[PDB]
Ligand binder design. Sequence first.
Ligand SMILES: CCCC[C@@]1(C2CCCCC2)Cc2cc(OCCCc3nnn[nH]3)c(F)c(F)c2C1=O
Ligand SMILES: CCCC[C@@]1(C2CCCCC2)Cc2cc(OCCCc3nnn[nH]3)c(F)c(F)c2C1=O
Ligand SMILES: CC(C)CCC[C@@H](C)[C@H]1CC[C@H]2[C@@H]3CC=C4C[C@@H](O)CC[C@]4(C)[C@H]3CC[C@]12C
Ligand SMILES: CC(C)CCC[C@@H](C)[C@H]1CC[C@H]2[C@@H]3CC=C4C[C@@H](O)CC[C@]4(C)[C@H]3CC[C@]12C
Ligand SMILES: Cc1ccc(-c2ccc(F)cc2COc2ccc(CCC(=O)O)cc2)cc1
Ligand SMILES: Cc1ccc(-c2ccc(F)cc2COc2ccc(CCC(=O)O)cc2)cc1
Ligand SMILES: [K+]
Ligand SMILES: [K+]
Ligand SMILES: [K+]
Lengths: 412, 412
Amino acid sequence: IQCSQRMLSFSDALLSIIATVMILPVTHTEIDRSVQRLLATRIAVYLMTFLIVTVAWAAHTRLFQVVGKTDDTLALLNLACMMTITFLPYTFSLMVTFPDVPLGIFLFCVCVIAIGVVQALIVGYAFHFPHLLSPQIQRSAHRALYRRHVLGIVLQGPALCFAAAIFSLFFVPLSYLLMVTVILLPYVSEPLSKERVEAFSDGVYAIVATLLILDICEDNVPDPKDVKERFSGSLVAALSATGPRFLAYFGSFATVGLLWFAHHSLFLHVRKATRAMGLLNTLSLAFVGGLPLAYQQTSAFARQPRDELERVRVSCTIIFLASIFQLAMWTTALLHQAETLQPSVWFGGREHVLMFAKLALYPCASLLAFASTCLLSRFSVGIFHLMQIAVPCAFLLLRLLVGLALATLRVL
Amino acid sequence: IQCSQRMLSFSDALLSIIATVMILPVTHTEIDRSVQRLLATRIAVYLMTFLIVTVAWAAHTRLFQVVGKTDDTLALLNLACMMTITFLPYTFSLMVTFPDVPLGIFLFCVCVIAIGVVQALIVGYAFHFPHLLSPQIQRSAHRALYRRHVLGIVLQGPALCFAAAIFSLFFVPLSYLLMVTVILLPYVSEPLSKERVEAFSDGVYAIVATLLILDICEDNVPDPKDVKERFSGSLVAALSATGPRFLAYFGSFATVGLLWFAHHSLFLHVRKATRAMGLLNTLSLAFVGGLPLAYQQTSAFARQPRDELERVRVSCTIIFLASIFQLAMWTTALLHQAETLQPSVWFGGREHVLMFAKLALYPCASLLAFASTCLLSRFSVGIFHLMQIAVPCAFLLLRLLVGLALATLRVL
Ligand SMILES: CCCC[C@@]1(C2CCCCC2)Cc2cc(OCCCc3nnn[nH]3)c(F)c(F)c2C1=O
Ligand SMILES: CCCC[C@@]1(C2CCCCC2)Cc2cc(OCCCc3nnn[nH]3)c(F)c(F)c2C1=O
Ligand SMILES: CC(C)CCC[C@@H](C)[C@H]1CC[C@H]2[C@@H]3CC=C4C[C@@H](O)CC[C@]4(C)[C@H]3CC[C@]12C
Ligand SMILES: CC(C)CCC[C@@H](C)[C@H]1CC[C@H]2[C@@H]3CC=C4C[C@@H](O)CC[C@]4(C)[C@H]3CC[C@]12C
Ligand SMILES: Cc1ccc(-c2ccc(F)cc2COc2ccc(CCC(=O)O)cc2)cc1
Ligand SMILES: Cc1ccc(-c2ccc(F)cc2COc2ccc(CCC(=O)O)cc2)cc1
Ligand SMILES: [K+]
Ligand SMILES: [K+]
Ligand SMILES: [K+]
C-alpha cells in the first residue's frame, strides 16, 4: 500500500505524449489540391486520435478515482494499460488508411479490448484487496454493486468493439456504427479530478509549445559542407535561411505559453472541475495543438498576397477557437460558481474582471485580427504581427489595463 | 500571490523535453567507419546537451526554492526563461559542429547570458516584493545579503560566458576553458526539491519510453500503393516487415517502464534528496535515454553473429549503467538513511531487502547477460531475449522471490 500521485502523474505524461503524437505528421507536411487534401486528412486524423486518446485518459482517470491507493502489482498493471493505450493512434491511423480492409478495424477493436481487459484486471485486483479502494467505496453499503457497475462500465467498450470485429468480416458500416457508439454512449447515455486535468493540460501545452524547437534541432542545424559551399563559409548566411523557422518557433511558443498562462490562472481558482469543463478543456487542447501548423504557414513563403490573407485568417481562426473554448470553460464554471470557483472569482468578486480579461484577451484579439483581414487587408499581416507584439504586453500589463477600464467605468 | 506548483510542473515538462530533444538524432541514425564515427559524435552531443540542460534545470529548481510563491509577472518571466533555455541544445550543437567558428561560441554564450539575465530579473522582482519569497528568506534579517548572494550565483555563468565570447575572437581554447568552468565550478567549488526531481525523471522516462512508438506512427504506417504493389495487397505482409520495429518498441517500453517502476519505488521512500542523489539521478537518466538505440540495434539485421554479440553486449552495458546508477543512488541514500529514507527502508527494516532486490534486479540481470555473451556466446541473443522475458516476471513476483531468499537464509 502506497500513495498513487506519482504513478498517475507518469500516466498523464504518457497519455499527453500519446494524444499529441499525431500532430507531428501534420507539422511535417510540406506546405496543389493533393497537398490540401493530404493536409485535411492529416488534420482529421490528428483530431480523431486526440479525441480517442482523451476519451481513454478520461476513462483511466475516472477508473483511478475508484482505486484510491496503488501497489506494486497495480503499478505494473497500470504500465501495461499505458502500453496498450499507446497503440491507439497508430492503429487508428492504419484503420482509417484502409477503411475497407477488415484487418485495421480488427486491430483497433483488439487494442480497445486489450485496454479494457487490463482495466478490468486492475478493478478486480483493487476490489479483491479492499484497502486499495477509496474510503467512500471501502465503506459503501454495497461495495460489490460498485464492482458490478465498474466492470460493466469498463467492459462495455470491449464488448462493442468485439461485436464490431465480428461485423468487419460481414458488414463494415455496422462495425463503424458500434465503434462510434463506444465513444458516444458514455456522454449521450460527474466531477473529474482536477490534478489529472491539470497534468494532462500541462503535458499537452509543453509538447505543443516545443514542437518547432524539436524540429529545428533535428533538421535545421547547418551542415559544414553546405555552409562552406552554398553560403561560401558564412555561418550567418546559413542561419539566415533558417530564420523563418526561428520566427515560427518564437510565435508558437509565445502563443502557447500565454494560452497556458491563461489556463493556469483559470485553474488556480477552480475548486472542482465538472466533466463539462473537461469536455471544453479537451476541445481547447485539441485546437491548441494546431497552433504550430498555423505559425509554420504564416512564416512560410507568400506566393501571392491572397495566400498571406488566407494563412493569417486560418491562424486567427485556430487561435480564436483555442482561446474561446477556455472562455467557454470559464463561463460554464461561472454558471455553477458556488461549487466550482473560489469566492474571489465569483460574480462581482475581487478577481472576477481580471480573470475575465485574462481569458478574453486572446479571443477578442483574434477576432479583431480576422476582422482587419477583411476590412484593412492591405495591412493584414502587419496587424497580425502587431498582435503577436501586443498580446504578450497586454498580458504583462493586464492589471493596469483592467484598472484603466475600471476607472473609465467609474467616470462614466 | 498564488501557488507555484503547476508552474514548476510545466517548467519540468518543458525542461525534460529540452533535455531529451537530442536523442532523436541518435535514434534516427541507421546502421562503415563513417557511420560509427557519426553515431559516436551524436551520442557525445546528446550526452553533453543532456548534462547542460540538467544543469540549467538544477539552477532553475534551486532558484525557485528561494522564490516561494508565484505571480502573473513571475509566470511570464518563467515562460521567458523556459524559452531561453529551449535554445541550449540547438545552439550547443551548432557550436560543436563549427568549433573554430566564433559565431557558435558567441551564440552559446549569448543563450546562457540570456537565461542568466532572465533569472536575475526573476530574483530582483521576487526580492522587490518580499511576500513572494519563502518564509525562511522572508523572516531573515539578511535579505540584502541574500539578494547579493543569489545575484552572484545566477550571474556567475553569464559573466564567464561573456568573457568567453570576448576570447572567441582572440583565443578560442580559453573560451572553452571558461565555458567548461561554468558547469564545473558550482560542483567543484544542499538538498534538491524532491517534487522537481520526480517530475523531471517522470518526463524523461515518459519521453524515452515512447520514442519508438512516435517514430513508428510517423514512418511505419503502411502506404496503400506499396501494400497493393510490393506486398501484392496483403496488409499482413506489409506489417511483417514492420515487425522488428514493434519488437524494439516493446522491449524499450518494457525496460524503461520497469526502470521507472524501480525509480518510483525508490523515491516513494525518500524523505529529502541530497544533491549527490541528484547527480546520480542525472547520470541514470542520461544512460536511460540510450535504451531505444540499444533496442533498435538489437532488433536490427544481423550481418554476422559477431555483430549480434557486440550489439547484445552494448545493450547490456547501457542497461547495466542505467540501473547501477539507481543502485548507487539507493546506496548513497542508505549512507544517510537517518534523514534521507523512511524508517521502513532503513538497514534491517521491513522493506529494506525488498527495495534492495527491486533496485538490483536489473544490474545483476545485465551483468549475467554480459557474462553469458562471453561464456555462453552461442546462446547469447537467446538468453538476452530470455532476460527480456525473465525481468518483468521477476518484477511481478519480486515479493515471492524475496520471501524465498529469506526462507533460504532462515534454513541456512
Ligand atoms: C513582452 C514582449 C516579449 C514577451 C515574450 C514572452 C512573453 C511571456 C510569454 C513568453 C513569451 C513574448 C514574445 C512574442 C514574440 O512575438 C514575436 C513573433 C516574431 C515576430 N517578429 N516580428 N513580428 N513578429 C516574440 F517574438 C517574442 F520574441 C517574445 C518573448 O520573449
Ligand atoms: C509478463 C511478461 C510480459 C510483460 C510485459 C509488460 C508487463 C508489465 C510491465 C511492462 C512490460 C513486458 C514485455 C516484454 C517483452 O519483451 C520480450 C520480447 C519477446 C520476444 N523477443 N524476441 N522474440 N520474442 C515483450 F516482448 C513483451 F511482449 C512484453 C509485455 O507485455
Ligand atoms: C476474445 C478476445 C479477443 C476479446 C474478448 C472480449 C469478450 C470475450 C468480452 C469483452 C467484454 C465482455 C462482455 C462485457 C459485458 C457483458 C455484460 C454481462 O452482463 C454479460 C457478459 C458480457 C457480455 C461480457 C462477455 C464477454 C465480453 C464480450
Ligand atoms: C552581450 C551582452 C548582451 C551580454 C551582457 C552580459 C554582461 C554585460 C553582464 C552579464 C553578467 C554581468 C556580471 C555579473 C555580475 C557582476 C558581479 C558584480 O560584483 C560586478 C559586475 C558583474 C561582473 C557583472 C558585469 C556585467 C555582466 C558581465
Ligand atoms: C463479465 C466478464 C467479461 C470479461 C472478462 C474477461 C475475459 C477475459 C480476460 F482476459 C479478462 C477479462 C476481465 O478480467 C477480469 C474481469 C473481472 C474480474 C472479476 C469478476 C468477478 O469477481 O467475478 C476479474 C478479471 C471477465 C468477466
Ligand atoms: C551587476 C549587474 C549585473 C547584471 C545586470 C543586468 C543587466 C541587464 C539586464 F537586462 C538585467 C540585469 C540583471 O537584472 C537585475 C539586476 C539587479 C537587480 C537588483 C539591483 C542590484 O542590487 O544590483 C535586479 C535586476 C545589472 C547589474
Ligand atoms: K529526421
Ligand atoms: K516528446
Ligand atoms: K518527435
